[PDB]
Amino acid sequence: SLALSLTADQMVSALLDAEPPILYSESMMGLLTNLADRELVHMINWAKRVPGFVDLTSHDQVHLLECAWLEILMIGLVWRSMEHPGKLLFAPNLLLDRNQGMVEIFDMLLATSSRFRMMNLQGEEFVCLKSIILLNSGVEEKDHIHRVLDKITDTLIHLMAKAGLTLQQQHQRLAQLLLILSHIRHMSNKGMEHLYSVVPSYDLLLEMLDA
Amino acid sequence: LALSLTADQMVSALLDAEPPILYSEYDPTRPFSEASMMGLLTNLADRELVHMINWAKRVPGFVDLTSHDQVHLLECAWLEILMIGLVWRSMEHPGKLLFAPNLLLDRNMVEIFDMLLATSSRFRMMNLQGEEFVCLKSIILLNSGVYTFSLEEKDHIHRVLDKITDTLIHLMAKAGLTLQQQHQRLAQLLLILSHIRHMSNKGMEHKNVVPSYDLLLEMLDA
């Protein structure tokens, strides 16, 4: 695979160019649903640019997206709201605070954003985490996925070492970031059930990917 | 002082703090019904929650927290902790879940069963060690509920979490793994915790469900 031959800088470079744009919004449910739908179209294009992803069968690509799509939207939102304490930046024209807040998810999203802030999470680290979520949430195929995940781990470590972190600080920060993903999974699952009152089907995601 | 222990002392403390393996109610009516099954699992979990409290209070740094914060962490992690314990017990039993030594069940509800099976085979594949297991379980306890905690208490937990990370890496280096393999294995282990969170959430949704704040507090003060 070409993904397995990528260096850390190349992995970072690839993920950075694959970044979807920050979309604008056009009731709260309507605006967010409209935003989420348009975001999903970009997520498909982004996923197909994640190194090692298209090497998977179309069936495996769908399953990964079906499991991780809300986590990816959420970590995006959290990343966007990082420099706006006490507020969620769904869109540049849709900045919501706690009072406008569902409130349980809101607080957890706020807590994740504040966590990214105190860790001063970098954009290079962020795109690494986002692709990790894609490949891990729904995980020869499983073997290949785990190899790519090792690459992203090596990529994360290289970024930290280049930033001047000691070997100890490197495994600690690596641990801190990956444990945040556990909280992201939790927010996603709670969001899913609160959503059932709307979700991308297997067939829908397969059709979008085939474009 | 938890933050003063060495890596070997951390492992030693975690191993000594391990809860015992419990049996489900002896001689239940077989085969099972959906009710009688859940009746046995509920009974087993309720008896396990008691020993988990004892284990929790022996986890380095946990008793340093206020009772309120201790309850919160347990309120968030208790099902995760029961599940990773289940997955650990089931490692040497391919295609089976070992809820109890007298309660070994195969696939033949089913979605969670499959998820637990996959995780167990994942542990078996990685050759997960006991010293690594108790570290992961301690991480779950301290991490699952940390994300809504005063600032000195949240900072303290992260230091203990950093300590267990050091302990994991120390175990891997001591075993002979290269620095790259150490990073990779550490990552693979913590990513599984995300799956465990997922299984816990699916299980939760599946009159007395939550352990209740008051019960957990009472068991803690005792």
Domain map of chain A by residue range? Answer: 1-211
Instruction: Determine if residue A207 is labeled as part of a ligand binding site.
Output: no
Distance CA B151, CA B6 (A): 25
CA dihedral (A99, A101, A107, A113) positive or negative: negative
Cα B56 vs. chain centroid, distance in angstroms? 10
- Any chain B CB within 8 A of the CB of A162? no
Distance CA A98, CA A101 (A): 5
User: Which residue blocks in chain A are alpha helix, DSSP H?
Assistant: 8-17, 28-47, 58-80, 103-118, 123-136, 141-162, 167-195, 202-209
Interchain pair B158, A176: CB under 8 A: yes
Contact B140, B77 (CB under 8 A): yes
Query: What is the DSSP secondary-structure string of A47-73?
Result: HTTSTTSTTS-HHHHHHHHHHHHHHHH
Residue whose pair of structure tokens reads 């991780």 in the numeric block: A68
Q: Determine if residue A156 is left, alpha or beta; phi over 0 gives left, psi from -120 to 50 gives alpha, anything else beta.
A: alpha
Distance CA B111, CA B206 (A): 11
Name the superfamily (CATH) of residues A1-211: Retinoid X Receptor (1.10.565.10)
Which residue among A175, A186, A190 places its CB closest to the CB of B190? A175
Q: Which two tokens stand for residue A43?
A: 């997520």
Q: What share of chain A is helix, strand, coil (3-state, %, to 5)?
A: 65, 5, 30
Which technique was used to obtain these atomic coordinates?
X-ray
Distance CA A84, CA B25 (A): 54
User: Which residue blocks in chain B are alpha helix, DSSP H?
Assistant: 7-16, 34-56, 67-89, 110-126, 130-143, 151-175, 179-205, 213-221
Residue whose pair of structure tokens reads 């085969």 in the numeric block: B31
**Nearest 5°: CA angle at A147, between B197 and A52?**
100
List, in sequence order, every beta strand (DSSP E) within B76-214. 96-100, 103-106
For residue A173, give the chain B residue with the closest CA.
Answer: B162
Q: What share of chain B is helix, strand, coil (3-state, %, to 5)?
A: 70, 5, 30
Beta-bridge mates of residue B96: B106
Which resolution, in Å, applies to this structure? 2.3
Closest CA to A177 of B194, B72, B69: B194
For residue A23, the one-letter residue type is L
Interchain pair B166, A172: CB under 8 A: yes
Backbone angles phi, psi at A95, to 5 degrees: -100, 110
Interchain pair A174, B186: CB under 8 A: yes
**B83-114 core/surface letters (b: 16 or more CB in 10 A; e: else):** bbbbbbbbbeeeeebbbbeebebeeeeeebee
Residue whose pair of structure tokens reads 């090792």 in the numeric block: A150
Backbone angles phi, psi at B96, to 5 degrees: -135, 150
B31 upstream amide cis, omega within 30 of 0: yes
Answer CATH for B1-222 from 1.10.10.10, 1.10.3210.10, 1.10.565.10, 3.40.710.10: 1.10.565.10
Contact A69, A40 (CB under 8 A): yes
* Neighboring chain B residues of A136 at a CB cutoff of 8 Å: 191, 194-195
Closest CA to B11 of B55, B63, B59: B59
Interchain pair B147, A108: CB under 8 A: yes
For residue A80, the one-letter residue type is R
Kindly report the number of other CB atoms within 10 A of residue A138's CB atom: 18
CA dihedral (A107, A109, A113, A115) positive or negative: positive
Distance CA A3, CA A146 (A): 12
CA dihedral (B55, B58, B61, B67) positive or negative: positive
